[PDB]
Amino acid sequence: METHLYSDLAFEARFADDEQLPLHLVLDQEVLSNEEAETLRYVYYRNVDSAGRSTGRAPGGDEDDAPASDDAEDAVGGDRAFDRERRTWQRACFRVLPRPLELLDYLRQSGLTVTLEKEQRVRMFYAVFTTLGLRCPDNRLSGAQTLHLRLVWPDGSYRDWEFLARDLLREEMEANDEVARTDEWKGAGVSRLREVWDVQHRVRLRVLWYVNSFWRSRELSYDDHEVELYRALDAYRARIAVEYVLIRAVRDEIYAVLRRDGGALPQRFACHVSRNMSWRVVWELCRHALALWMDWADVRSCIIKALTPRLSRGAAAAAQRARRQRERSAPKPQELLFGPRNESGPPAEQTWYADVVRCVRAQVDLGVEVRAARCPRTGLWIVRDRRGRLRRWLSQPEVCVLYVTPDLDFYWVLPGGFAVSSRVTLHGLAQRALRDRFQNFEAVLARGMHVEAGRQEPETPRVSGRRLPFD
Amino acid sequence: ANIFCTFDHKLSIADVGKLTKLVAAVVPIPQRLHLIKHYQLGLHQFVDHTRGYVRLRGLLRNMTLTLMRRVEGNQILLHVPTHGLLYTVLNTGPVTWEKGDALCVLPPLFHRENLLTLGQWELVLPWIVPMPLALEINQRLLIMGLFSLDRSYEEVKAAVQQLQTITFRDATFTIPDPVIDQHLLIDMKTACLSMSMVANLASELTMTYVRKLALEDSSMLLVKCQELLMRLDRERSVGHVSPDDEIARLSALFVMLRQLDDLIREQVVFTVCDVSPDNKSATCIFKG
Amino acid sequence: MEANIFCTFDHKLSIADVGKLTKLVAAVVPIPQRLHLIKHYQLGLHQFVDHTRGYVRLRGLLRNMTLTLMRRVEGNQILLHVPTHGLLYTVLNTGPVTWEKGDALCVLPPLFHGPLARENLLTLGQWELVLPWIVPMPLALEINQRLLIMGLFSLDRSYEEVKAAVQQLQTITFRDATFTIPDPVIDQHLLIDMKTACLSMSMVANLASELTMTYVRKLALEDSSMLLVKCQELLMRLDARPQHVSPDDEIARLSALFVMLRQLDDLIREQVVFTVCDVSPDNKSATCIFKG
Amino acid sequence: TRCLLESVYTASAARAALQWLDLGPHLLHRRLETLGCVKTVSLGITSL
Amino acid sequence: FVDALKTLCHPVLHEPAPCLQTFTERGPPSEPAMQRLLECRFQQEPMGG
Amino acid sequence: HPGFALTAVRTDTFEVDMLLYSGKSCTSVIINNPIVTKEERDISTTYHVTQNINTVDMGLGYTSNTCVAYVNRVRTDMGVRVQDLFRVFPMNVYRHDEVDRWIRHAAGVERPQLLDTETISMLTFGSMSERNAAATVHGQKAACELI
Amino acid sequence: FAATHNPWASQAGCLSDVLYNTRHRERLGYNSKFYSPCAQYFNTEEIIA
Amino acid sequence: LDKILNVEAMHTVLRALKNTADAMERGLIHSFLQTLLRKAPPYFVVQTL
Amino acid sequence: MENWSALELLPKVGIPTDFLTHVKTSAGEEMFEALRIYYGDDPERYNIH
């Protein structure tokens, strides 16, 4: 309850500078699980307009509108593009109520008065109360605007939903001694409770409306044109298409390399092979596997998980250091004798991600981590299980694999270790599209974490529904 | 625990007779020695014409406080009391003590019958005053210091004349004005600017830190603090910053309030529970 | 009271143990519980030392402990003595901090000093005699202030923004020595301290007079000096006859403002435990008045 | 262990020994003759 | 001077690579008076117009 | 040439050996038998012994006289470095900030960088602001005062 | 009490510092056997020690 | 051993007494010499007179 | 680490001691390999164990 009140006052004190109106939300088991509710660290929200443009960026356009680079030296913009993305998200206050409750009884047991149009109870295993701001860029609010909600957890993992302002305001705008603001806020109470879905109808959350909000006083205008909603839908379409266009880029690359080579696949992975085998049925199984990979590829494909560490801020500088290191001049005798010893080069083992596609019972594994190293005798690759065990799927006739190396080289491997090899091309995606869709979250400091970086943080914060809360 | 004081100057019948009237009074000395010279006796060594009351109040804090307990000859014997034991002390300040008062030491403001002068040097002893009178004298001096830039107006002249006058049980006296020749002494000036600077820095920084801490736990106290800030800004409405500069503002706030610790705090030195009828002397329990 | 405390050792002490434990006579060692008989594990700070939890946690445990002065060691017994208020004792500074005469001394957990050796003492098994630092008040409230400012500044900042500022804040220079504050985590206790700071600052901003607010602007119109230049510069990037003249309003507001300022000061000021008046010219011991 | 040994042997003589080893084409054994085992040392800039 | 040539015309005096290396190792001064010395930007531009 | 001249004033210190002459019985020395006081402590006891000495000057005229016999070093450098007035008067500024900063940069004098407790104590009360040089081969800085 | 009388000899990494300081001489390929008069003044690390 | 420590304590008391007496004697010499210097005008003044 | 307490308890040979400079000067400027300086009376010599 107090988070809504404080956030209302906070958005009022900031309204002239920001023009963000305070939207009060409640989340339950329809949007997040109990562990995610108890261990939630941050909530972040983003405003994008009827043209797909975030309100943290330049109002007319950005240098991120140019296509990506494919260079590790550039890393799709480097630190500046990362900073332009981080500036686009804004942080929201939130409180978790981790034990089962019924919402209206909770509000009445607090100071509030509730006078809903129909007294329908809603019951919820846990509740997260948070306030997001949707930006009326003037005293005018459009229905084609969408708002993004981000929930983040201590390991840095995040979950994004997005819903457009028309869903939120479908009803609310379509109808449009001395006292303390706290007492009249409680006395005036709540009279609305509306259920809103995100655009893709994945998650439901409830919006809570108060009659004491400064929202009521402003008498600003709202509108939804058809063409604006059409353009907003097109921008949304471009948003969600970003991983699938990369998947199709890899698919077209595989077919293009296969046409270029003439179907001759050289061995790149170690596996003892026999001549006296029906290699043609292996080619047929390769066809079925390459169809099935397109059937089941997803956002959690190896290609997205390979590009994601490239978008991190350190990536460009580290790539330039590596470029300098590999092309360093051979040391003179003086340096070897008197000077410092040379930097150790890249470790013999690399970390990769793979998509393992088995045909016999159609199944595709996507976010698979493997360790790769070249065996000394022949420079082929040995792919090992991240517990150090040799991966056996090279020996199974009914499985093909697509690996993507950390430098965005991809292999597509058949039984026997004969592979198609090429590079993932990012040029079909604007730098902003990739960069905003897949940039990793970087944490701001909070309760229970070291001021110094790199420290082993102590017991992570939690709000417990199973235990009597400590103070 | 006796400290010997010797006079580098020719004593006389009237000097020793004047000094023997003080045979229980509180005399502060700069640091603990076994044999000191009379120059270190009293507050005279610290007096100058540029710093004044606040500087003395700071200096008097970390002197060692002592009771006079004999004059054997050309030498004076001083006894340094220990915490908790009961001692006989002379009242020579501007007021009278009742049973159970908490007594404070202030630099003196009035000064004839006491004054032992020899060779441009004279024995100057602090005021032993009950705690409420010390607090009120202090606040009155500070407010007179803040009125120091607008003495051009007749109402402020009257207000300073009202601040100068203090009445306390069966006594009445005027606190001297910290403004001499239209100008405020250096230490009172820096005390006043420290108070004003801490006020301004608080008013500038509080909103940002309220937001930052409310992002962690939005307790009701933070709600009321934010409401109070918004009200303050409405009152001001009648008419981004770098990390280095934020750290500079925070550090400046804290170093400015370190300047005030002498003024804001007030040590109790003696607790009085036995009084002579004369009100000339009382026996007190020592706090140190 | 329990004027004397017997500390019994379970490990048999070698010749070297008894020697080095004898040299430590008059050192200030804390006990958690104030009991007549204790075991050697309870002696010192080693029971609590834990570098994953922060410096503020160990500070909170230490400020609540009972402090004693070491006396003659005998066979497996160490004989700790509790000082009493107002009396005069000889105290030992195992810390690297310098003491000048007249200093007021506080107790704090040890800091990181350059050489990194730090002289581990009495490593019996895997217990160790971790003594606190007896620090004079200026350095004590300097470390408390810097620690609070790190907590207050670095909230909601990322590590990239934080890094250089907190590197600069961790190092303290005091009397030509250089120390570093070990583990400044954002604790629950530190957040309580920050909340008290915010409330006290709100009350300062609200209840300050107009005189207390506007003195600096008027002095800047009147006067010019380096001090005033610095004060103005602190206000710069955010940067008349009184309409009310009320000595009673001024007195009310000022007597309240001093209260809020004392609240804000207690976040920085520690409890004085010793006051020195005699320092050995080798700075290895002092004569002190015990305070509490 | 190799990092430990390299941290110990940080003089011109030892690094020169390693360079003289790796520089030629011969194998190690066509390049090394085994003397006995050692038991006495007197220390000096030229040691015995 | 012609006697000095055994020293003067040796390469080590004419290559500045160690001098520039140690000049970069130290970094620029942080002193406020030296800071005005670091303030200077050179930009290559096309010569057409 | 600016148009005015300087008279510089410098003080140099010398380490010296004195010669004192005195006449027989030129002064009387009355001394008492020493008294002792005891100062108790937990692990030590301190005894303070003091003796009164009072002297009478027995001659009429001066009965004793001192010579400055031998000098055996000069403590100061006898140099030509002038006294930094900005260190003597640390509070004065120019009323215009631009010219103040420009003047201080031209003369080569450091402005305080932050408003610490020690900066305020220096500005208001004074301190040993002029830090020791790293090396000193000529002993002490005999500053030259200009009129 | 001047900063220097030879800027090319008294600074870190100036010409004569890289020439005559033994730590810079061995990053160059110097022959150690030849005695150098400048070495005592320019081996600043020996001086510090 | 108790006898040895008793002798050691008597002897440190004796050394302290002798050292303090000798300190007072040297102090009397020092005080007298300082007294004379306050009353001892230079050569040029006394030869003038 | 030397056993200074035995040195204090054991009998000694009384010698005319000659340092060119002040004792505190030759101690403070590190003329001696091993030192122990203490002020007042140090009880360490009394606890025989």
mmCIF file of C-alpha atoms in Angstrom, chain C residues 1-194:
data_model
loop_
_atom_site.group_PDB
_atom_site.id
_atom_site.type_symbol
_atom_site.label_atom_id
_atom_site.label_comp_id
_atom_site.label_asym_id
_atom_site.label_seq_id
_atom_site.Cartn_x
_atom_site.Cartn_y
_atom_site.Cartn_z
ATOM 1 C CA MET C 1 31.691 -5.904 39.684
ATOM 2 C CA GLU C 2 33.797 -8.678 38.200
ATOM 3 C CA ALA C 3 36.900 -6.498 38.478
ATOM 4 C CA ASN C 4 39.128 -9.328 37.212
ATOM 5 C CA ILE C 5 38.553 -11.939 34.523
ATOM 6 C CA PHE C 6 40.398 -15.250 34.227
ATOM 7 C CA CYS C 7 41.039 -16.407 30.668
ATOM 8 C CA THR C 8 42.079 -20.064 30.527
ATOM 9 C CA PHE C 9 43.855 -21.543 27.521
ATOM 10 C CA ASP C 10 43.071 -25.032 26.241
ATOM 11 C CA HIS C 11 46.103 -25.214 23.958
ATOM 12 C CA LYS C 12 49.310 -25.664 25.908
ATOM 13 C CA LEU C 13 51.350 -22.503 25.444
ATOM 14 C CA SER C 14 54.935 -22.879 24.276
ATOM 15 C CA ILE C 15 57.800 -20.724 25.506
ATOM 16 C CA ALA C 16 57.229 -18.382 22.562
ATOM 17 C CA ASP C 17 53.512 -18.074 23.378
ATOM 18 C CA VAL C 18 54.170 -17.065 26.975
ATOM 19 C CA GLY C 19 56.836 -14.604 25.862
ATOM 20 C CA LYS C 20 54.741 -12.821 23.255
ATOM 21 C CA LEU C 21 51.706 -12.901 25.546
ATOM 22 C CA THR C 22 53.821 -11.256 28.253
ATOM 23 C CA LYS C 23 54.931 -8.465 25.923
ATOM 24 C CA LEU C 24 51.225 -7.735 25.319
ATOM 25 C CA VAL C 25 50.553 -6.746 28.957
ATOM 26 C CA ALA C 26 48.334 -3.599 29.110
ATOM 27 C CA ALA C 27 46.918 -4.179 25.615
ATOM 28 C CA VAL C 28 43.202 -3.473 25.190
ATOM 29 C CA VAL C 29 41.363 -6.726 24.438
ATOM 30 C CA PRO C 30 37.579 -7.169 24.270
ATOM 31 C CA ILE C 31 35.349 -9.886 25.746
ATOM 32 C CA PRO C 32 31.763 -10.435 24.556
ATOM 33 C CA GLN C 33 30.100 -11.401 27.793
ATOM 34 C CA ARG C 34 31.729 -9.873 30.907
ATOM 35 C CA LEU C 35 32.099 -13.084 32.922
ATOM 36 C CA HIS C 36 34.504 -14.007 35.698
ATOM 37 C CA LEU C 37 35.898 -17.029 33.809
ATOM 38 C CA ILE C 38 36.195 -17.335 30.025
ATOM 39 C CA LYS C 39 37.921 -19.609 27.514
ATOM 40 C CA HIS C 40 40.543 -18.343 25.093
ATOM 41 C CA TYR C 41 38.243 -18.650 22.079
ATOM 42 C CA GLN C 42 36.087 -15.827 23.433
ATOM 43 C CA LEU C 43 39.132 -13.560 23.755
ATOM 44 C CA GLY C 44 39.581 -11.018 20.981
ATOM 45 C CA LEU C 45 37.720 -10.336 17.758
ATOM 46 C CA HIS C 46 38.455 -13.665 16.062
ATOM 47 C CA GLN C 47 35.101 -15.162 17.039
ATOM 48 C CA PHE C 48 33.398 -12.621 14.767
ATOM 49 C CA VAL C 49 35.892 -11.863 11.988
ATOM 50 C CA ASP C 50 34.190 -12.614 8.692
ATOM 51 C CA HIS C 51 35.215 -10.766 5.539
ATOM 52 C CA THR C 52 32.200 -11.719 3.431
ATOM 53 C CA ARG C 53 29.999 -9.828 5.858
ATOM 54 C CA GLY C 54 31.007 -6.206 5.969
ATOM 55 C CA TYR C 55 32.989 -3.832 8.139
ATOM 56 C CA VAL C 56 29.818 -2.333 9.628
ATOM 57 C CA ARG C 57 28.738 -5.690 11.076
ATOM 58 C CA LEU C 58 32.007 -6.151 12.951
ATOM 59 C CA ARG C 59 31.801 -2.501 13.995
ATOM 60 C CA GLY C 60 28.373 -3.145 15.496
ATOM 61 C CA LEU C 61 29.513 -6.245 17.371
ATOM 62 C CA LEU C 62 32.623 -4.495 18.682
ATOM 63 C CA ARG C 63 30.899 -1.338 19.940
ATOM 64 C CA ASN C 64 28.781 -3.580 22.195
ATOM 65 C CA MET C 65 31.662 -5.648 23.600
ATOM 66 C CA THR C 66 33.332 -5.322 27.005
ATOM 67 C CA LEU C 67 36.925 -4.079 26.920
ATOM 68 C CA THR C 68 39.749 -5.228 29.203
ATOM 69 C CA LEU C 69 43.460 -4.627 29.802
ATOM 70 C CA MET C 70 45.793 -7.623 29.752
ATOM 71 C CA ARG C 71 47.812 -8.456 32.877
ATOM 72 C CA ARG C 72 50.424 -11.037 33.919
ATOM 73 C CA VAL C 73 50.141 -14.418 32.197
ATOM 74 C CA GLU C 74 50.769 -17.596 34.190
ATOM 75 C CA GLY C 75 50.335 -21.262 33.298
ATOM 76 C CA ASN C 76 47.347 -21.390 30.914
ATOM 77 C CA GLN C 77 45.757 -18.294 32.519
ATOM 78 C CA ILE C 78 45.907 -14.730 31.245
ATOM 79 C CA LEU C 79 44.098 -12.587 33.875
ATOM 80 C CA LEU C 80 42.209 -9.770 32.087
ATOM 81 C CA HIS C 81 41.376 -6.588 34.021
ATOM 82 C CA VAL C 82 38.366 -4.340 33.389
ATOM 83 C CA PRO C 83 39.158 -0.618 33.618
ATOM 84 C CA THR C 84 36.792 1.633 35.530
ATOM 85 C CA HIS C 85 35.530 5.113 34.754
ATOM 86 C CA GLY C 86 37.650 8.053 35.835
ATOM 87 C CA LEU C 87 40.781 6.121 36.732
ATOM 88 C CA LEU C 88 44.200 6.205 35.106
ATOM 89 C CA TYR C 89 45.699 3.289 33.185
ATOM 90 C CA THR C 90 48.610 2.444 30.917
ATOM 91 C CA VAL C 91 47.403 1.260 27.513
ATOM 92 C CA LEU C 92 49.260 -0.289 24.601
ATOM 93 C CA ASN C 93 48.745 0.574 20.929
ATOM 94 C CA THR C 94 49.386 -2.488 18.820
ATOM 95 C CA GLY C 95 47.767 -0.516 16.010
ATOM 96 C CA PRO C 96 49.930 1.474 13.607
ATOM 97 C CA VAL C 97 48.128 4.737 14.419
ATOM 98 C CA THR C 98 50.032 7.639 15.965
ATOM 99 C CA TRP C 99 48.872 9.142 19.257
ATOM 100 C CA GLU C 100 49.485 12.779 20.133
ATOM 101 C CA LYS C 101 48.981 14.104 23.641
ATOM 102 C CA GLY C 102 45.453 15.037 24.663
ATOM 103 C CA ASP C 103 43.822 12.762 22.086
ATOM 104 C CA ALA C 104 40.433 11.197 22.683
ATOM 105 C CA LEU C 105 40.553 7.542 21.671
ATOM 106 C CA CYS C 106 37.899 5.245 20.186
ATOM 107 C CA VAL C 107 37.725 1.506 19.450
ATOM 108 C CA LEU C 108 37.225 0.273 15.889
ATOM 109 C CA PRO C 109 37.933 -2.892 13.905
ATOM 110 C CA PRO C 110 41.361 -3.000 12.256
ATOM 111 C CA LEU C 111 41.927 -1.452 8.835
ATOM 112 C CA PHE C 112 44.202 -2.548 6.014
ATOM 113 C CA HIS C 113 47.676 -1.052 6.446
ATOM 114 C CA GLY C 114 50.097 -1.013 3.528
ATOM 115 C CA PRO C 115 52.667 -3.732 4.318
ATOM 116 C CA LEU C 116 49.928 -6.438 4.496
ATOM 117 C CA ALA C 117 51.918 -8.374 7.104
ATOM 118 C CA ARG C 118 49.937 -6.898 10.039
ATOM 119 C CA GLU C 119 51.764 -9.089 12.606
ATOM 120 C CA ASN C 120 49.558 -12.114 13.244
ATOM 121 C CA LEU C 121 49.807 -12.931 16.960
ATOM 122 C CA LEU C 122 49.167 -16.123 18.912
ATOM 123 C CA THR C 123 47.934 -18.361 16.122
ATOM 124 C CA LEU C 124 46.965 -21.233 18.445
ATOM 125 C CA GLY C 125 45.714 -23.879 16.036
ATOM 126 C CA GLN C 126 43.365 -21.787 13.924
ATOM 127 C CA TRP C 127 42.413 -19.306 16.626
ATOM 128 C CA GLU C 128 44.199 -15.974 16.576
ATOM 129 C CA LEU C 129 44.557 -12.896 18.756
ATOM 130 C CA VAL C 130 42.834 -10.296 16.580
ATOM 131 C CA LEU C 131 42.970 -7.093 18.622
ATOM 132 C CA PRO C 132 40.985 -3.979 17.674
ATOM 133 C CA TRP C 133 42.510 -0.638 16.776
ATOM 134 C CA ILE C 134 42.533 2.097 19.420
ATOM 135 C CA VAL C 135 42.159 5.137 17.186
ATOM 136 C CA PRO C 136 41.998 8.862 18.049
ATOM 137 C CA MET C 137 38.662 10.566 17.459
ATOM 138 C CA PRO C 138 39.495 12.467 14.214
ATOM 139 C CA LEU C 139 40.367 9.300 12.300
ATOM 140 C CA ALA C 140 37.478 7.463 13.945
ATOM 141 C CA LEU C 141 34.807 9.842 12.768
ATOM 142 C CA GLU C 142 36.605 10.220 9.433
ATOM 143 C CA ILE C 143 36.229 6.489 8.757
ATOM 144 C CA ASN C 144 32.643 6.495 9.996
ATOM 145 C CA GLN C 145 31.874 9.489 7.759
ATOM 146 C CA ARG C 146 33.518 7.992 4.669
ATOM 147 C CA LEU C 147 31.731 4.690 5.236
ATOM 148 C CA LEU C 148 28.368 6.443 5.520
ATOM 149 C CA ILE C 149 29.056 8.520 2.399
ATOM 150 C CA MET C 150 29.964 5.370 0.459
ATOM 151 C CA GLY C 151 26.677 3.799 1.510
ATOM 152 C CA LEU C 152 24.714 6.955 0.722
ATOM 153 C CA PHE C 153 26.405 7.715 -2.623
ATOM 154 C CA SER C 154 26.744 4.254 -4.139
ATOM 155 C CA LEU C 155 23.075 3.270 -3.819
ATOM 156 C CA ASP C 156 21.390 2.821 -7.209
ATOM 157 C CA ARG C 157 24.729 3.330 -8.967
ATOM 158 C CA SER C 158 26.317 0.621 -11.081
ATOM 159 C CA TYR C 159 29.787 -0.737 -10.386
ATOM 160 C CA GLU C 160 31.290 1.277 -13.249
ATOM 161 C CA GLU C 161 30.074 4.573 -11.805
ATOM 162 C CA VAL C 162 30.882 3.460 -8.250
ATOM 163 C CA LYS C 163 34.377 2.139 -8.774
ATOM 164 C CA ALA C 164 36.668 5.176 -8.832
ATOM 165 C CA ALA C 165 34.661 7.123 -6.260
ATOM 166 C CA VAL C 166 34.682 4.339 -3.680
ATOM 167 C CA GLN C 167 38.348 3.640 -4.376
ATOM 168 C CA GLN C 168 38.999 7.260 -3.480
ATOM 169 C CA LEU C 169 36.719 7.067 -0.435
ATOM 170 C CA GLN C 170 38.230 3.892 1.036
ATOM 171 C CA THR C 171 41.705 5.385 1.460
ATOM 172 C CA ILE C 172 42.224 7.609 4.506
ATOM 173 C CA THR C 173 45.417 9.549 5.196
ATOM 174 C CA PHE C 174 46.083 10.394 8.833
ATOM 175 C CA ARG C 175 49.305 11.793 10.305
ATOM 176 C CA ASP C 176 51.423 10.675 7.338
ATOM 177 C CA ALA C 177 50.089 7.122 7.544
ATOM 178 C CA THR C 178 47.816 5.545 4.933
ATOM 179 C CA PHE C 179 44.981 3.123 5.718
ATOM 180 C CA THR C 180 42.221 1.422 3.715
ATOM 181 C CA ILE C 181 38.769 0.353 4.948
ATOM 182 C CA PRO C 182 38.430 -3.413 4.346
ATOM 183 C CA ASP C 183 34.855 -4.406 3.374
ATOM 184 C CA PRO C 184 32.281 -1.624 3.032
ATOM 185 C CA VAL C 185 29.187 -3.665 2.191
ATOM 186 C CA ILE C 186 25.690 -2.167 2.043
ATOM 187 C CA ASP C 187 24.391 -3.793 5.222
ATOM 188 C CA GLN C 188 20.972 -3.684 6.842
ATOM 189 C CA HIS C 189 22.547 -1.679 9.676
ATOM 190 C CA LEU C 190 24.053 0.779 7.214
ATOM 191 C CA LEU C 191 20.649 1.251 5.580
ATOM 192 C CA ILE C 192 19.176 2.023 9.007
ATOM 193 C CA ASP C 193 21.901 4.642 9.504
ATOM 194 C CA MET C 194 21.199 6.109 6.061
#
